[PDB]
Amino acid sequence: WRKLQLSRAKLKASSWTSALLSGFAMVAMVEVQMLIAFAICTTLLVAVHMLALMISTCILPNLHWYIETAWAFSTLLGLILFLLEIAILCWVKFYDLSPPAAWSATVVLIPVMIIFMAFAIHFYRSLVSHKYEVTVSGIRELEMLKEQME
Amino acid sequence: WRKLQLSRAKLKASSWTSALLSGFAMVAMVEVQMLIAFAICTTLLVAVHMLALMISTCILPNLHWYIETAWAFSTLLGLILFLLEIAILCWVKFYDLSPPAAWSATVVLIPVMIIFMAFAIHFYRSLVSHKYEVTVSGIRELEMLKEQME
Amino acid sequence: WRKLQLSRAKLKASSWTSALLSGFAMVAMVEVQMLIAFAICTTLLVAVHMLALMISTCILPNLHWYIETAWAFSTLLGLILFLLEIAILCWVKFYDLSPPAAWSATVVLIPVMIIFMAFAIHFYRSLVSHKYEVTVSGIRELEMLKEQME
Amino acid sequence: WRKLQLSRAKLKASSWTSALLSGFAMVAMVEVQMLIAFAICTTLLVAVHMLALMISTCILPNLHWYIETAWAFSTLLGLILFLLEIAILCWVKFYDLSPPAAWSATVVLIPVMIIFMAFAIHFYRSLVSHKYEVTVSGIRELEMLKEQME
Amino acid sequence: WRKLQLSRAKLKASSWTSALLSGFAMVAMVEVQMLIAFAICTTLLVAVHMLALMISTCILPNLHWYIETAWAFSTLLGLILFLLEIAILCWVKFYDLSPPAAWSATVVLIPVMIIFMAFAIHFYRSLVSHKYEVTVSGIRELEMLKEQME
Amino acid sequence: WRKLQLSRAKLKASSWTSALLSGFAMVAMVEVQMLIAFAICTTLLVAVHMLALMISTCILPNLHWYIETAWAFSTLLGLILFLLEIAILCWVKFYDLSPPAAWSATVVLIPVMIIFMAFAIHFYRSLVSHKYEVTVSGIRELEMLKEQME
């Protein structure tokens, strides 16, 4: 039951962020209307989220952990892309009369972006260690039973 | 019960994406205001989602798997259309002064679009094989009982 | 319990689409600002959805199937109206400099619109037959008991 | 338990429509920027919904049926006001160059508006009769027991 | 369990109204772009809602009734501020060419605003009396047992 | 079970505020289009919320309290940033013709901002004391059993 709720809640959240972020991001582009980055970033941002949405459709009928990786990976990319997207918007929006201020946007971006990616690595690292920790603990317990068995 | 939750959660998600995507997409068109593609893509995008929404209405009262195909198919089309829609927006929005950058939008589109459709095929293929796998496994188990039966 | 969830989920979805579609549709009209069709379509679209919303208010306290028809009918109309609405937007938005491309919008509309209404008829027809099928099966079973009864 | 779910679901729906409708309606006014009607209708529309939202706050802690009337009444008013609001928008939006088309908006409004209010009266009337029907049926059953009692 | 659902449902509703109202209100200000009131009202409106959102974060981990007062109070303020906000928008939006119509907005505001605040007082008053009523009823019942006790 | 619902509800709320606030805030910037503050505040606001969204993805699979701190901290920052963001918008929006009124926005900001941060400290302080209170009460009860034990 614990696993059932995990997927159910995640499904709603996935479409929640993907749909809204893609919509607002799309509107952001039409409203404003370096150049290549803005176009590519926007297209990729939408595409990545769309992939996640599809995952919501396939997961319902349903190796399971494999797709889980695709969803988390895709969802994560969208978040990074959205962050990159807003950074470009600040640079592009002010790019006309505000170029001086535009720089502060990307400059401040690096600090949070690095921590964003770095934080994920630290968490993943701890998770990896735990898997190994259980691996050693599991075999040991089994060995104890094996020794007393004889 | 497992099946009940699958439909319940899916129903909310369907209207979730269909309603939001259609709304934002519609707003994207009015804000900006090759030419034929933009008009057709927008109209089709909305129509496809509307079909899915109706499916949410008919599924409640309720062969069942058949309609399931219509919903997944329609929902999937909307996602592809939305991706195509944003690609057109980038080309159209910049189409005025930014035509040069506009190309990068569609060019980058192909890469993700191919993977989007290709990924679905791979998943479906594995699903098809599993169905056949169970088919062979099922008859075999039944035969074992039939042999011992005699 | 199966019936309880059906209404509960449907209630959220109804307000979901009706509220969002009406809001975005309304915004679509103010942003842009044949002529008569656009005004009437927009007004009707909003009115139909509003009716559905009210249905959500009356259903809670609660012949039951009768109102169900009103909700499904009203909700269905809104979907058709929204589709018609976007079609008009494409024609009206481009109606200024883009009239040539504007035609493709309504032309492509017919194909999907016909399938949209036609698909509903097919589903309803099957439902009607089932009702009659059960009618014959029900009386037959009762007759069997009546015969053996004597 | 049946009563618990009724309030829980209604609470989410109330804020759902009230919040969204008020937000979009508010945006509709700023975008466009007979005259008095538009200003009053918009203000009243928002105020009515706000009242409903507050009701959601007071109902949680919690005569109960009395407040229920306030919520339904307020929510209903908002729906009627929103319908009136969009009708004004069509008239006002086109009011500049499109006056000829603007008339069709309010004209078509009356038809649906009358049915909207009239339909509610019919449903309420049937509900009132049912209350009386049970009243007569209840006393009759009690009398039967009283007669046999002696 | 009854108390658990009360908080769970309220949490979703709080963020629901606070997030949407703040977002739309913020957009309303940028779109339009007496003067001091508009600036202060908008800032306060957002701030009050933000406070409520934070309350949603603190309540999860969790004297309990005390915070409940803060949430209801903050949420209530936002509703009043939003109502005041729209009133200012009508006056400001028309304030340029539409001054004649702008007045009707604030004038009609007073009527509903007074009833909005007055209605709350009446409800609170009844609640206060009930607390005292139980106080007298509780001691009396206890005294009856004390008398017979001797 | 009590803990399960706490995370489930919080997950939906997190994405709820983060997604909406980021979207509306992003749109607020494009619509309007001291200078440096606006650019940095907007970028940081989005980045902080994105971090929270990712947390929603990692929490599902899942030391637990540690991440809880990151989510609450990140979510809290976004709220403060959003408040700061709107304050800047009022100053920037009016910054053109309305500079005189622009000051009232930031001035009024301080009052609520201080109370916003101060209120959190008071609540946290009480929580800290409670932890210590239980610490003393816990050891005391255990000691009583230890004494009677001998």
Author numbering:
A (entry chain C), B (entry chain D), C (entry chain E), D (entry chain F), E (entry chain A), F (entry chain B): 148 to 180, 191 to 219, 240 to 327
Provide passages from the article that reported this PDB entry.
Orai was identified as the protein that forms the channel’s pore and STIM was identified as its regulator. The channel is activated by the depletion of Ca2+ from the endoplasmic reticulum (ER), and as such it was characterized as the calcium release-activated calcium (CRAC) channel responsible for store-operated calcium entry (SOCE) before the molecular components were known. The channel is formed from an assembly of six Orai subunits that surround a single ion pore, which is perpendicular to the plasma membrane in a cellular setting. Each Orai subunit contains four transmembrane helices (M1-M4) and a cytosolic M4-ext helix.
The K163W mutation corresponds to R91W in human Orai1, which is a loss of function mutation that causes a severe combined immune deficiency-like disorder. To exclude the possibility that the crystal contacts in the H206A Oraicryst structure were responsible for the conformational changes we observed in the pore, we determined the structures of wild-type (WT) Oraicryst and K163W Oraicryst grown in the same crystal form (I41). Well-defined electron density maps of WT and K163W Oraicryst were obtained using non-crystallographic symmetry averaging of modest (6.9 and 6.1 Å, respectively) resolution diffraction data in the same manner as for the H206A Oraicryst structure. The structures of WT and K163W Oraicryst reveal an ‘unlatched-closed’ conformation of the channel that resembles a hybrid of the quiescent and open conformations: the ion pores are closed as in the quiescent conformation but the M4/M4-ext regions have conformations like those observed in the H206A Oraicryst structure. The conformation of the M1-M4a portion of the channel, however, is like the quiescent conformation, and as such, the pores of WT and K163W Oraicryst are closed and indistinguishable from the pore in the structure of the quiescent conformation. As in the quiescent conformation, anomalous difference electron density for an iron complex is observed in the basic region of the pore in the unlatched-closed conformation. The density is positioned roughly in the center of the basic region in the structure of WT Oraicryst and located in the lower portion of it in the structures of the K163W mutant, which removes the top ring of basic residues from the pore. The K163W mutation has no other apparent effect, and this is analogous to observations from structures of the quiescent conformation with and without the K163W mutation. Congruently, we observe that the corresponding K163W mutant of Drosophila Orai can adopt an unlatched conformation with a closed pore. The structures of the unlatched-closed conformation reveal that release of the latches does not necessarily open the pore: the pore is closed despite the M4b and M4-ext helices adopting the same conformation that they do in the H206A structure.
